[PDB]
UniProtKB/Swiss-Prot annotation:
Binding site for Cu(2+) 2: H6, Y10, H13, H14
Consequence of substituting D23N: In CAA-APP; Iowa type
Residues carrying a glycan: Y10
Residues annotated to bind Zn(2+) 2: H6, Y10, H13, H14
Annotated site location: Cleavage: D1, A2, D7, S8, F16, L17, F19, F20
Quaternary state and interactors: Interacts with S100A9.
Compartments reported by the entry: Cell surface
Source organism: Homo sapiens
Effect of E22K: In CAA-APP; Italian type
Gene name per UniProt: APP
Record's protein name: Amyloid-beta protein 40
Amino acid sequence: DAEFRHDSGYEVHHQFLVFFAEDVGSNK
């Protein structure tokens, strides 16, 4: 219950998925 009880927003914790995101998408 309450699997967001911290208000983290997000956390990839992997510069591989994000690495893809940054390259493939113009997110940043």
